[PDB]
Amino acid sequence: DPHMSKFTWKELIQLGSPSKAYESSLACIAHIDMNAFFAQVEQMRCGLSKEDPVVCVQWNSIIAVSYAARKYGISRMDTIQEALKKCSNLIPIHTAVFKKGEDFWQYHDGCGSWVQDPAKQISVEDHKVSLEPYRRESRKALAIFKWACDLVERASIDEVFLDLGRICFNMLMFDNEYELTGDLKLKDALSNIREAFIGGNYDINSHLPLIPEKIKSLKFEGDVFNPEGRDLITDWDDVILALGSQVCKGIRDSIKDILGYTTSCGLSSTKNVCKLASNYKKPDAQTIVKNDCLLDFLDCGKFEITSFWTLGGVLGKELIDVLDLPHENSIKHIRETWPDNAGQLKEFLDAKVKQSDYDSNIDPLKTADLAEKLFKLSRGRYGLPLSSRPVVKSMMSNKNLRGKSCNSIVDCISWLEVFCAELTSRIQDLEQEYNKIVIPRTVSISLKTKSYEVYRKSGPVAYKGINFQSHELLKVGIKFVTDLDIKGKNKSYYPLTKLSMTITNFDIIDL
DNA sequence: GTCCTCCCCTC
DNA sequence: ATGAGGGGAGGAC
Numbered sequence: 001d002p003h004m005s006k007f008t009w010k011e012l013i014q015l016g017s018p019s020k021a022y023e024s025s026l027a028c029i030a031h032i033d034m035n036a037f038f039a040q041v042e043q044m045r046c047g048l049s050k051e052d053p054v055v056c057v058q059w060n061s062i063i064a065v066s067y068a069a070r071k072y073g074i075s076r077m078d079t080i081q082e083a084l085k086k087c088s089n090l091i092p093i094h095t096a097v098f099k100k101g102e103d104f105w106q107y108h109d110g111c112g113s114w115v116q117d118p119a120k121q122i123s124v125e126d127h128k129v130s131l132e133p134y135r136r137e138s139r140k141a142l143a144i145f146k147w148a149c150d151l152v153e154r155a156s157i158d159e160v161f162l163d164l165g166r167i168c169f170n171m172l173m174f175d176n177e178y179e180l181t182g183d184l185k186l187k188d189a190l191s192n193i194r195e196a197f198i199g200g201n202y203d204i205n206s207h208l209p210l211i212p213e214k215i216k217s218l219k220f221e222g223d224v225f226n227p228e229g230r231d232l233i234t235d236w237d238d239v240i241l242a243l244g245s246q247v248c249k250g251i252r253d254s255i256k257d258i259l260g261y262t263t264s265c266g267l268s269s270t271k272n273v274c275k276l277a278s279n280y281k282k283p284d285a286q287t288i289v290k291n292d293c294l295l296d297f298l299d300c301g302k303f304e305i306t307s308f309w310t311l312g313g314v315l316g317k318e319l320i321d322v323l324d325l326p327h328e329n330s331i332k333h334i335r336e337t338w339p340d341n342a343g344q345l346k347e348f349l350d351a352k353v354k355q356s357d358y359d360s361n362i363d364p365l366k367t368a369d370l371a372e373k374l375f376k377l378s379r380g381r382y383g384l385p386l387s388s389r390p391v392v393k394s395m396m397s398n399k400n401l402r403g404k405s406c407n408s409i410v411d412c413i414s415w416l417e418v419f420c421a422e423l424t425s426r427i428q429d430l431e432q433e434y435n436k437i438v439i440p441r442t443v444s445i446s447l448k449t450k451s452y453e454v455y456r457k458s459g460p461v462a463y464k465g466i467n468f469q470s471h472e473l474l475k476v477g478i479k480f481v482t483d484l485d486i487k488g489k490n491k492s493y494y495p496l497t498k499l500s501m502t503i504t505n506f507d508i509i510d511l
Numbered sequence: 512g513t514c515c516t517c518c519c520c521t522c
Numbered sequence: 523a524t525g526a527g528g529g530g531a532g533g534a535c
């Protein structure tokens with residue numbers, strides 16, 4: 001019915017449910033990604049400004065580039081020597097490090113390969129990186145996000161997704177302060193819907209009324225992606241999104257004011273679109289993608305089907321082959337080739353997979369799910385839930401090895417001693433920060449030989465308290481690296497090119 | 512039944 | 523041939 005909203009009371013009320021809000025076409029999701037994260041951490045640590053051309057350096061490689069340094073054309077994975085040729089007043093700052101034979105990390109500021117002084121080097125042969133300064137700042141940011149929002153997913157060290165559904169719903173129905181104009185409050189613009197909601201006499205399966213003309217005074221905060229100049233507020237999804245944009249700016253301002261960090265952000269009805277949108281404009285910006293602008297956005301020329309999370313690897317390339325996708329404008333191609341329903345794409349996939357001479361990363365028993373995923377992704381309507389993650393899931397300590405710096409079992413164990421110190425300190429920090437007992441249950445050793453062959457072993461680790469944790473980790477590590485040395489007998493083995501220890505499973509006890 | 516090994520995904 | 527981490531399949535146990 002064109003006399004009513006596209007959306008229902010069910011879809012609106014669902015915003016108030018953390019378990020179901022993501023399923024709604026009215027969902028308001030944010031993806032927030034810290035700008036030049038490791039470079040901003042170093043900037044803040046060293047009392048420097050947004051205008052200072054800071055780069056974070058790991059060995060000889062630039063792993064994060066401040067937006068000031070980007071103005072000189074410096075890019076991630078430039079070597080420090082390449083970057084110094086682009087910017088005469090560059091401020092390179094090496095990551096903190098552990099020294100082999102020691103059990104703590106520190107910064108050696110004023111030290112690095114770019115420094116002439118032979119006494120101020122950080123040798124790759126006898127140090128490993130500590131990323132703990134970045135992890136600590138990430139956890140501080142997470143605490144701020146969780147204070148602001150009831151459902152926050154930490155997606156990686158500098159990314160979160162927020163479900164703004166409760167905040168948006170509550171603002172829509174209950175906020176009696178918010179002003180649209182100097183003459184018009186939100187409460188008065190939304191008098192009809194609030195009357196219905198408080199009155200309680202709606203049917204959940206009824207469509208909402210068409211939006212009131214007065215709510216069109218509501219502003220979006222940020223950059224609304226809108227190359228076709230579509231009307232900004234035309235249905236309740238736009239109302240929810242605009243309210244979300246206002247809230248989202250407030251949350252990002254809290255991060256900036258408290259921690260000093262700028263962020264980029266994407267706002268839309270789905271996690272996948274949010275993640276694309278947060279990368280669209282940087283630094284210090286939020287890009288908003290209206291439902292009516294989803295195809296405009298997806299088809300802007302920046303994106304392909306391989307841009308979507310899970311599809312950037314071998315499954316994505318397989319789908320390009322199987323579905324006969326073009327090298328460009330693949331998203332539109334998917335949309336237009338199976339234009340009516342996901343069943344059209346399912347039929348096509350089923351025929352391809354049923355062929356006797358097929359194989360693959362496609363599950364032949366789950367083609368319905370794959371078809372629906374692709375159909376919806378190509379329209380910007382594939383809604384995945386947010387997961388609130390545990391305090392920790394895994395912890396890894398890794399050293400890729402050069403030359404002969406791991407040339408025997410003695411060297412392996414020397415590196416394991418650093419790994420065990422590092423992991424134990426990380427566990428202790430988490431226990432204190434979160435008031436938990438954090439208990440490693442399973443450990444994995446993974447290593448690569450001189451010929452790049454991978455050897456791995458995993459198994460249980462015993463628990464005897466935090467004061468014996470490093471010892472219990474090392475016991476198992478020693479057992480595993482000696483076991484693997486035997487397995488490598490009479491084969492290309494030493495000197496190793498990689499050694500790592502990962503705690504892959506933890507028990508977390510609440511206190 | 513769960514564990515171990517290999518593998519794919521992302522920044 | 524360049525340190526994290528999330529996650530699942532399936533044969534081993």
Ligand SMILES: Nc1ncnc2c1ncn2[C@H]1C[C@H](O)[C@@H](COP(=O)(O)OP(=O)(O)OP(=O)(O)O)O1
Pocket residue numbers: 033034035036037038039063064065157158282522525
């Ligand atoms: N391939 C990588 N290897 C090691 N560290 C990485 C890699 N990619 C990114 N990082 C680290 C450094 C980054 O500051 C941090 C967050 O990554 P990411 O958000 O992609 O870049 P960024 O925060 O430096 O820039 P942007 O402003 O584009 O977000 O993770």
Ligand SMILES: [Mg+2]
Pocket residue numbers: 033034035036037158
């Ligand atoms: Mg970032």
Ligand SMILES: [Mg+2]
Pocket residue numbers: 033156158159522
């Ligand atoms: Mg990232």
